[PDB]
Every structure is written in structure tokens, then in C-alpha cells.
Amino acid sequence: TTALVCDNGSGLVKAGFAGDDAPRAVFPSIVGRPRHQGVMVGMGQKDSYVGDEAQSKRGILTLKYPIEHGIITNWDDMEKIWHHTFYNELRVAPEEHPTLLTEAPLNPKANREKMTQIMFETFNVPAMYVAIQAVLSLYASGRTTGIVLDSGDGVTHNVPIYEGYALPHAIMRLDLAGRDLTDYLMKILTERGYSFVTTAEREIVRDIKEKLCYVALDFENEMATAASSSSLEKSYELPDGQVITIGNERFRCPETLFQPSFIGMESAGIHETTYNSIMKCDIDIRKDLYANNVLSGGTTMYPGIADRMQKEITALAPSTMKIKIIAPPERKYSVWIGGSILASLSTFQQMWISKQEYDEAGPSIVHRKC
Amino acid sequence: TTALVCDNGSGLVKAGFAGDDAPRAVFPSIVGRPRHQGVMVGMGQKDSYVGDEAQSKRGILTLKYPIEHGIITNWDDMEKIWHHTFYNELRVAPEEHPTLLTEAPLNPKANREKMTQIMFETFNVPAMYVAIQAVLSLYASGRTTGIVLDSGDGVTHNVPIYEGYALPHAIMRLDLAGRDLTDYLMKILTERGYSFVTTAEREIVRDIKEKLCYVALDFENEMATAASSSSLEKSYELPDGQVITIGNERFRCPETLFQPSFIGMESAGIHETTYNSIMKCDIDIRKDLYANNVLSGGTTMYPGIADRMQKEITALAPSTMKIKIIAPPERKYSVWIGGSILASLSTFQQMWISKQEYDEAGPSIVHRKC
Amino acid sequence: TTALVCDNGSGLVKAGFAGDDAPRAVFPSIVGRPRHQGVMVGMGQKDSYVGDEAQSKRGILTLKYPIEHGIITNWDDMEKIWHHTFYNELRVAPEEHPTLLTEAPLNPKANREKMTQIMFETFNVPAMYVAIQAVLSLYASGRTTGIVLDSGDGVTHNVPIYEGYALPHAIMRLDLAGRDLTDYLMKILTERGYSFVTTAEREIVRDIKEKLCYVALDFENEMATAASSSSLEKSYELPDGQVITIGNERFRCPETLFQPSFIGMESAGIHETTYNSIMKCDIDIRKDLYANNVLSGGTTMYPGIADRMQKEITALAPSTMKIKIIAPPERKYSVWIGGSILASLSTFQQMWISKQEYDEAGPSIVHRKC
Amino acid sequence: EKYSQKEDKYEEEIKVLSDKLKEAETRAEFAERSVTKLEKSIDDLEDELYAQKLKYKAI
Amino acid sequence: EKYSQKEDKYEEEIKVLSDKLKEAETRAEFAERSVTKLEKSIDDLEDELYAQKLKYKAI
Ligand SMILES: Nc1ncnc2c1ncn2[C@@H]1O[C@H](COP(=O)(O)OP(=O)(O)O)[C@@H](O)[C@H]1O
Ligand SMILES: Nc1ncnc2c1ncn2[C@@H]1O[C@H](COP(=O)(O)OP(=O)(O)O)[C@@H](O)[C@H]1O
Ligand SMILES: Nc1ncnc2c1ncn2[C@@H]1O[C@H](COP(=O)(O)OP(=O)(O)O)[C@@H](O)[C@H]1O
């Protein structure tokens, strides 16, 4: 029987069937609840909307993401989202499909334990499994060696792999991603007069970020140029008219990935954490790591991020080794694509956590062997 | 058992049975008392006349409205009017029918408390309910989303609704309506020589207003045109002969709705308060509010009011939105029509305020739950 | 040569000389223009009245605040107010005094640019400077560490300071203040019968708010108590007689600061935003932030606001740290007091923006270095 | 009117004094609950230290 | 007359509530020093218990 792949992430649910080429369902990981009164007797008021139905009733709801930084912090809402994904989007019975869930590295054990307990109890899946997003991204890239930088909506992390062997001591997890860039942009837009405070307005600002922002190859003279002329200004149109124009914000927003001090964080930029995770590996494999930087996730989709990353890592690394940033055009779905590939492998069909194994060993089976 | 709908209003009582298409009884909400002597012994002098009986004998009576600005300010007269409505117009027994009264938003609590106390005590209705006029108007318009501008005889108010959710912080209530226009016309007709000071003469002027007045699309050039030629002059015949002719008064009277400074008020015109109530709503729903302006009430019946409204709001809103003024031809009875629809819904039969709930909770039950 | 301190604010201008203990001039930041006709030939009709002269001719004027939410939205009226402040209230020549203006954090750049351009051009100040109201409030409190809560007439904002270092990523700005409470009270008073719609009537309602309103320690049982007895009712006398009495409105008005949903806002109460701004700072300084909550501004003057704030933050924070709310008895002028202390410092005399620097760098010098 | 304003300042003092009275009463009750908690905790600590003393003197 | 009697009632409420605030704050601070010494006792108990754990892990 076929299996399900359910890459959760903190900003977008991506589900589908093991074997396909792309996720069948892609919708926001949002649960909305009404704020206002409700006066039309007989309108049939739902209690809560999920997915992109909550995105269309956006104006009257207060939206909540049940996953904050890769960690599930509201389990009822996560159960609602999974129920939606299984029944309304994929239209299957979870009792007839092994499920391949996905998780970021270096996050609490209770996350996986509760995940597998929820699956086996309130969905009665025949089997399940929890992979690491970076490994699946490597599968999708068609490699067995490289340092993959995954940057979604909640968490950025590097995982260096060599010949299919992981270097767990060199895994470096950073905690700024798309959502912190959205918040920084909401803050920077105030200095032009635009004010976005609501959750719905946060979605509007996320769309502005996805449409107008880009990474500057050289931040300082780009700033000077934006101050000199006005050729960098684009115009966006809110969903009530009200055209707005932004200038240097376009590249001041994603620059936070390379200077996390803009949001008051002490960490280093993604280029420097990548270089550090490389230099934490054995001296023999880093020459091959330098040439297999695999970008993944949505936050790595800005125009000009590959060139800036290559420039920075080249300036850091020795002047001989060949830096090579691999950025596929569909890198936003690499985790799901690799998950489908993995779940389709014949030799993988022994790694599932059968229901009987759980019935014996409790929820703690998940990190014991799998 | 069928239910009654009793849209009260401050200038006209519209009553009927829940399920009909139009109110069964429509008469003025007025109470007259004789002022003169009375000499013919045995003529059978009544103490007071109500409804449109007081309208035909108005030559010898002094007329009084028991509702000033949506607020009932004479509870004995209002009890007389309700007694008339039940026994002489509808010819039913109030002890056998739930009654759906109606009220304007943002008016004192004692109004609804006294309404329900009067009903339950001096009429012994089995149950009752007090709705909001704008919600019922939206029911009758066949929508669940829109900003409805209701304008009757006493009060003008906007209520924005979205997907059946009210935005009670954006409700705006204005206190000029048909009656203030009637008074302004009584004051403007003096500058041609005609003098109406009596209450009966106020009724005559109300009829002049309902027959000869219209809203000018462009006030200034219309003024200049009326000054240039004399093609705008119509003639009216009072009920004793004495033809009168009015000129620019025809459009100077309803223009007060768009320039409330003419009667010395500080507010903004109905177009501007509509735009403000829209701009007080969440940025996502106002594009759908812009295209569902639902006019209601008698004061919105002037010829050319929809076009002036659309011109003004279009000039105020962004140049991309589609402003649509929805003005049905029967918009004078939308509140009653919607009230009948509402009282006919099967899911509504649990929202009544039963006699027993009142007996347990006092008159405060009305707003406390319902 | 002495310097001037000109804390503008959206509701009250407070000006004076650097070095005093209290502002010399405190008047409403308002500009009135006559509505009505004007008949007595020779009365010397002024075009517009400013300050508290517009407050005594209030009955015939239409008042306008030139500052909406900390942002100057009418630059001609703001220039009128500044001209008044300099010449008729302080009675000085602006060409002989550096000027210390004040601004709220996180508001557009054009505000400060236009402010400094106005000063240097149409007043020819020798130098100027634009401070942040929270820093000055801390100066006046006699501290170098704390999280202030400044809440004036237009904007409420927290700024956490430690050892004289600001945490700009933890600054949280909120947009409900005295004016939104005044409007909410104007709305809540209608449900008891009283109707205030004019701008003058808004001033009357502001005075009612300043005299009769307080913050309930526990909102729910306070509500139940006001419903049970009638010992919470006070009486107020409008300036024509006409005594009015209010009950639970007294504490329902300022409760909006703790439940901003009453006016249809999605934000959190001031206690929750204070706690969030604390929890956004480094784990080492927040124990010292918990014990230095500095209240400032007029809107923090309600009776019982410090007690409610302490109760709420205590319920939110861990059960070991000591919550101290520092509410001085003169907290309404802390920004001005701190501004005078700052402008009087010897080591500050190098931070002024001399006129020559502006002549060289344009109005952009302001946020460039100062 | 002088009597009026004196009565007003009086009722102002009354209101603020009663507010701080209720706050302080809740504070006192919470402090007493805290005393109870500390008695319980010192009891548990005594028990555990005594058990460890028993074992140590035994060995 | 009503102002005189209302001001007298306000005065007696002032006095009673003032003395009550006095006694309440005193009993509060005294119970709080009690709390303080109980916390210090918790500290001493935990330290001596740690010492006994040390002796047990040694022998
Ligand atoms: N074209 C784009 N350009 C820049 N950023 C994008 C783009 N598309 C998505 N993003 C960012 O990526 C985030 C979603 O990425 P995704 O890979 O779905 O994260 P997750 O896997 O955690 O759901 C969004 O928050 C958005 O800010
Ligand atoms: N055809 C018309 N043209 C202009 N005004 C009208 C017309 N018909 C009624 N009116 C005005 O509408 C008012 C009555 O409207 P209505 O909706 O019945 O008010 P209410 O709901 O308060 O009873 C009258 O005061 C009258 O001036
Ligand atoms: N004693 C008081 N009690 C409650 N509110 C007050 C009091 N005094 C002033 N206010 C409110 O504070 C506002 C003015 O505060 P202020 O600090 O002057 O604002 P700004 O700093 O913006 O000028 C007014 O809108 C008023 O509603």
C-alpha cells in the first residue's frame, strides 16, 4: 500500500503521496477563530477555520500558528491541522497508510514522542516514521555528500553529510527564519508611515516580503545607491487600494540573515555558521563540503541569496578551494520531494515503526531505533 | 403558531405577520388630541386619536410623535399606539403570538427594558425579541456581507457586517433623518412667503418633501442652473387651493444629508460617515464592504441619492475599488421584510425570550442574553 | 544661554526653560476655527484660536488636534501651535535658545525631518535636538535601569533600558491612549441616555473621564458589585446644569487598557505587552527590569492602575521575582522634567544639532547622528 | 460648596484607603499561605536530611 | 446638615481605615520576616542535606 508524506514545517503544511513528484496539498499551517460578535441568526458559524479557508475569512479571525520555532506548542490546533490534512485535503483514511512525518534537528524529545502518540492513537496509522529535513533535502538534491542549509519559517539549520554519514557534533541550529524577517519588516515599514499590527496584516506583510524583497550583493554601496537615486523603489497594492512604495527595506529585510544583530540577536550570519559547521568537520571531508552547499526551504528563495552566500563563504574559506552553492529552482519543496523518494524506497520498508512495536514499547520507541 | 413583526420606527408603524411579503398595516406613528372647544352635545368626543384617524381629523388636533430620535419618550402614547396596532389594525390577540420588535443601535438600555416589560405585562405576549434594524435590512437584501445605511424618520446609522459578523466598534449613528429635513424645509419655505407653523402644516410639508424633492448630482452647478432658468420649478396644491411653487428648495432640502452644516450640525455627510465606518474596519474586508453598500429606510428614497452617494464615495475611496450602491425599489420596507424572514426561520425559534425566562430574570433579560 | 524644552505630545503642550522644576506653560494642543456666521460688525473676528483660548470660545469653534497618534498630520496647525508657544506663552525669541523637542519611538522619519526643518527655517533656532519620551521619563525617575510605560494621549509604548543601554528590538508601541478611552466613554455614555457628538462635547467627556474614572482591581466582581448595589454611582454637572450620573462606566472606560478588545483591537493589554517586552530581553537583565516598572504620562493617572498592573504582572511572571510598579505622584510631567534635566547637563552641550550642521547636511542630519 | 469640596476630598481618601486596605488584606492572606508552604518545605527537608543522617551513621 | 454628617462619617471611616492599614502593614511585615527566616532555614536544611549526601556517596 502507498504511504503518506506530511512535511509539517512552521509556515506551510505540505502533504502528498509517496511516489509523486510534488506535494498534492500545500496550505498555511494556521488555525483561525472569530473575534467579533455574529448577528446573522442561521449563518452556521463554525468554531474555527484551518488552512487556507482561515486565510480567506482572514479579516474577522485571529490567526495562530500552532508551531512556533519548529516546536509544536498547541497540540489541539496541531491535531486540527492534521485532521484537516487527512480528511479534507488528501481525502484518505489514515488507517490505511504509513505516514512519514518530518522534524528539525535538535528539538525536544517530547515533540517526537507526542507526535507518534497522536498518530498511533487518534489516527491509528499502520506505521509511521520521523525523518530529518536536511537528509531528505539531500535525497532530493541527488547527492550523498554535502552541507545542506535548510531555512524554513521557524528555524535555520546546517547538517553536514559525507558518504551518507552524518556529523551530529557539527549540526548547528539557528533560530531566525522567515517569521522573524516578517516581523522585522513589519517594524521597518513603520518608518515610512505604514502600520501593520494585526495577524491579518502580518499575512499581508509576508506577501510583501515574498514579492519585493531581495538580497543585496554588497549591502553598504547598495544602501548608498538607494539613498542616491530612487530606482530601487517598487510599489505594492494592499487589498483595498492604498498603494505603498518601499525603498531600501527591500534588501534591509533579508539582510538580517547575514547580520542577525538587526533584530538584536547575538548569533552569526548564515554564511558564518555554515563556515563554522564546515570547520567543525574532519579536515579531509571539508574540501568536498565546500563544493556541495545545498540550499533548501522557503527562506532561501530571495533573489541574489546564492551569489551573496558564495561571495561570503569565498571570502571566509581558503583562497584555493572551490565554493559551490547549489540552489535548485524548486528548492522550496526539497524536503517533501526527498521524503517521497525515501518513503518509496524498497529497502526502507523495514524502518517503519509498526503499530505493534509501539503497543509494546510505548511512545519512547521513536528515538530508540528510529 | 405564527408570529408578529412590529417594526416601530419614529414616523411610521409597519406591522404584519411573519411569513408575508409586505407589512399588513402601515400608518403614521402619531397621537392626536383635540385642542378646540367642542359644542355639539352628543357628538361622541374621543379623548385621543391614533394612527391615520388622527391624520384625517388633524385640522382640529395637536399631533405628537411618541418617538423622537429612535427613543420612546412618551410611554403612554406608545402603549396607545401598540394597543391600536394589535386590536384595530391587525385584529389579533397579543396573547397568542410571539412579537418581534425592532430598535436602532446605540440607544439607551431602558428603552429595550421598558419595551419588553410593557409587552410581557400589559400585553401578555408568549415571547418576544428585539432585533437591530440594519441586520434585518441585510436579511431582506439577500446578503451576508455589506455596510448598510439605514435612514428613517429619526436616526441614520451605518452597520458593517462581514460573513454574518457585526463590527460593533465601527457602527456609526447620526441624528439627522427625515424629520430634520422636514423642519429644514419648513424653515426654507418661509423665504418664498409660505408659512407653516402648525403640526398639521408640518404634515403638509412632509408630503411636499416626499413629492417634489430630489438630490442634485452636483450641488453648485445645479444651484447656478436653478438661478439661471426656471425649468426646475414645480407646483404643489395645498388642501385648500393655494398653489405654491418651489424652486431650488427641491434639492436644497435633501442636500442637508450631505452637508449637515445647513441645519447647524457639526457632523459629516452620510457619504463621509459611510466612508469612515468602512475605514474603521479590518483592511481585508473593506474591499467587499465597498461593493455592498445597502441603502434602506424612507429617507433614502429621494431621486438621485444613489448616484450622488456613489459619486461621493468613489471620490473618497481609492481609485481601484468598485463602489456599488445597492438601492432596491422597495427599500422603504426592508427592515420589516427582513424581520419577517428572520422570524420565519426554524432555527430562530430558540432565540425567543419566553415568558418564563422573563418571570425568572426580570426585564434585564433582554440585553443580558438576547 | 538657557535652552527650551517643548514636550509636544498629542494632547497637551508642556513648555518651559531647561533647569526649572516644572513646565512654565501647559495648554491643550488644539486649534479652533469658527463655524457660525458672525454678525456684529467690528468684533474683530480672529481666523483661528489656539491653546486654551480655543478652549474658552469652545462653544462656537470646531476644534482639531494637529497630532493624531504621535504623528503630526497638519503642519500648518502645528506651526501655529509652536508660534503660540514661543511668543504668547513663553514670551521669548526662538533665535536665542536651543530647543529640545520630544518624539515617540517607532514613528515615521518624515516626522523628525519636517520637525527639524520647521525649527531651523521658520524659527531660526541656534540648535535643536529630538529625544525619546521614555528616556527622559527615566531621567526624571532618577534611575538608569527599568522598563517604562509611557501612555499619553495618542500612543502607549514600553522601552526597556538597562545600565543606560536601550534594547531597541524590545520596544513595543501600542496605539490606544487617552483619546481612544475618551471615545469609548463617549460611546458607553449613550447606553445611559446622554449624547455627546460635538468636539466641545468631547472635551466635556474628557473632563468626566479625568474626574470620575478609576481602574477596578478585579473587573468581574467589581461589575457584579456595581450591579448589586448603587454605591459606585457618582454625579457630574455639565456646564449648563443637567446633572448626569454614571455607574459601572467609571471603571469600564479605563479597563480598555487591559482588554483592548472592548474597542475592537486585537492587541493585548498593557500588562501583557509589558511582560512581553520584558521576556524579549536577555535573561540576565529581566530580574532587574521586573522591579523597575516606571509609569509615565497622563493615561497612567487613574486611581488603582498601579495596583492592577502589579497584580497582573505578578500573575504573569514567575512566583519568585519581586514586581515593583514605580508610579510617582507627578508622573504626568516626567517627560518634561527629564527633558529639562537632560538639556541642563554639561556633557550634553555637544549633542545639539548646530545650525551649521543642518546647513551642510540637510534635514537628514537629525536621525543621522542625533 | 466648601462643605461639598471637603466631602469630595474625604470620599477620595476613603476610596483610595479602602483600595489599599483590600490589596493589603489579600497580601496578608497570601503571606500566610506562604508561611504554610515554608513550614511544609522545612518539614520535608528535615525528613530527608534525617534519613540521610540515619544511613550515614549506619555505614 | 447632610454635608456635616457625611463629612463626620467620612472622618470616622478615615480613622478606622487608617488604623487598620497600620495594623495590617505591621502584621504583614512581621509575617514577612517570619517568611524570610523560614526561607533561610530551607537554605540551611538543603545545604546540610547535601552534606549528608556527600558523606553517603563517600562512604
Ligand atoms: N519567494 C519567496 N521569497 C522570499 N521568501 C519566501 C518566498 N516564499 C516563501 N518565503 C518565506 O518562506 C517561508 C515559508 O517557507 P517554508 O519552506 O514553507 O517553511 P516551512 O518549511 O517551515 O513551512 C515564509 O515565511 C516566507 O516568508
Ligand atoms: N418618497 C420619499 N421621498 C423622500 N422622503 C421620503 C419618501 N417617503 C418617505 N420619506 C421620508 O421617510 C420618513 C419615513 O421613513 P421610514 O423608513 O418609515 O422611517 P421610520 O423607519 O422611522 O418609520 C418620513 O419622515 C419621510 O420624510
Ligand atoms: N487625572 C487623570 N485621570 C485620568 N486620565 C487623565 C488624567 N489626566 C489626564 N488624563 C488623560 O491623559 C491625557 C493627556 O495626557 P498627556 O500625558 O498630557 O498626553 P501627551 O503626553 O500626549 O500630551 C488626556 O487625554 C486625558 O484623557
For residue B266, how far is its CA from the centre of ligand 2 (angstroms)? 23
Distance in angstroms (rounded) separating the CA atoms of residues A276 and A293: 13
- Residue B165's DSSP bridge partners are B162
Neighboring chain B residues of C187 at a CB cutoff of 8 Å:
106
- A57: DSSP letter: S
Q: Is B90 on the interface with A (CB under 8 A)?
A: no
Q: Which of B65, B81, B270, B332 to mutate to test the pocket of ligand 2 (most atoms within 8 A of CB)?
A: B332
DSSP B279-343: HTS-TTTHHHHTT-EEEESGGGGSTTHHHHHHHHHHHHS-TTS---EE--TTGGGHHHHHHHHHH
State the distance between the two ends of chain E, measured CA to CA, in whole angstroms: 86
**If you measure from the C-alpha of residue A189 to the centroid of ligand 1, how many angstroms do you get, rounded to a whole number?**
19
How was this one solved?
Answer: cryo-EM
Of all residues in chain B, what percent are helix, strand and coil, respectively (each to 5)? 45, 20, 35
> Best mutation site among A12, A67, A236 for ligand 1, i.e. most ligand atoms within 8 A of its Cβ?
A12
* Separation between Cα atoms, residue E55 and residue E57, nearest integer Å: 6
CA gap B159, B334 in Å, rounded: 15
Ligand 2 binding site (Cβ under 6 Å of any ligand atom): B 9-12, 152-154, 178-179, 182, 206, 209-210, 297-299, 301-302, 332
A105 three-state secondary structure: coil
Chain C nearest-CA distance from B169, in A, is 6
DSSP state of A210: H
Q: Which residues of E touch D48 (CB under 8 A)?
A: 49
Choosing among B114, B156, B266, which should be mutated to test the C contact, i.e. which has the most C CBs within 10 A?
B266
Task: Give the Cα separation of A13 and A197 in Å (integer).
Answer: 25
Look up residue C172 and give its amino acid. Answer: M
What is the three-class DSSP state of B38?
Answer: coil
The CA distance from C52 to C54, in Å, is 5
**In angstroms, rounded to a whole number, what is the distance separating the alpha carbons of residues A52 and C247?**
45
- List the single best residue of D10, D19, D22, D29 to mutate versus C (max C Cβ within 10 A): D19
H or E stretch at C274: helix C270-279
Alpha carbon A43 to its chain centroid, in Å, reads: 36
- Contact at CB, C307 and D19, closer than 8 angstroms: yes
Identify residue B120 by its one-letter amino acid code: F
Classify residue A299 by its DSSP letter: G
Rg over CA atoms, chain E = 25
DSSP A235-286: EEEEBTEEEEEESTHHHHTGGGGT-GGGGT--S--HHHHHHHHHHTS-TTTH
Q: Is the dihedral of CA C226, C227, C228, C230 positive or negative?
A: positive
A126: amino acid identity, one letter? P
Distance of CA B305 to the CA centre of its chain: 16
D52 neighbors E49 (Cβ within 8 angstroms) = yes
Q: For helices C305-316 and D2-58, give the axis angle rounded to 10 degrees.
A: 20
Question: Are C133 and C335 within 8 A, CB to CB?
Answer: yes
Show the CA angle centred on residue A232, arms to residues A230 and A234, nearest 5°: 105
Closest C-alpha to ligand 1, atom 9 = A298
| Residue from C211, C200, C104, C226 nearest C154 by CA | C104
DSSP for C175-186, please give it.
---HHHHHHHHH
Q: Do A197 and C170 touch (CB under 8 A)?
A: no
What is the interface size between D and E, counted as CB pairs within 8 Å?
A: 87
Q: Using N-to-C axis directions, what is the helix angle for B178-188 and B199-212, rounded to 10°?
A: 100
What's the Cα-to-Cα distance from B81 to each of B3, B8, B64, B88, rounded to whole Å?
A: 19, 10, 12, 10
**C chain contacts of residue A199, beta-carbon cutoff 8 Å:** 266
Q: How far apart are CA B244 and CA B188, in angstroms?
A: 14
Residues A255 and A269: beta-carbon distance below 8 Å: no
| Residues in Cβ contact with A147 at an 8 Å cutoff, skipping those fewer than 6 apart | A158, A159, A160, A161, A274, A277, A278, A289, A292, A293, A294
Cell numbers at residue A363, please?
511512545
For residue A18, give the C-alpha cell: 509517496
Distance CA E37, CA B206 (A): 85
b/e per residue B65-91 (b: at least 16 CB within 10 A): bbbebbbbeeeebbebbbebbbeebbe
At C117, list the grid cell: 526643518
SS3 C72: strand
> H or E stretch including E3?
helix E2-58
Beta strands (DSSP E) in A280-365 are 293-296, 325-326, 353-354
Dump the DSSP string for D8-54: HHHHHHHHHHHHHHHHHHHHHHHHHHHHHHHHHHHHHHHHHHHHHHH
- Contact state of C187 with B106 under an 8 Å Cβ cutoff: yes
Task: List CB contacts of E29: < 8 A, sequence separation 6 or more.
Answer: none
C-alpha cell at B56: 384625517
Tell me if A97 sits within 8 A of A4, measured CB to CB: yes
CA of residue B6 to ligand 3 center, whole Å: 46
Which DSSP symbol is given to C254? G
Take residue C148 and report the three cell numbers written for it.
517604562
- Mutation target to probe the B interface, by most B beta carbons within 10 A, among C36, C62, C190 is C190
Asked if C192 lies within 8 A of B109 by C-beta distance, the reply is yes
Determine which residue's CA is closest to atom 10 belonging to ligand 2: B298
Report how far apart, in Å, the C-alpha atoms of B286 and of each of A299, B144, B283, B313, B317 are: 31, 14, 6, 13, 10
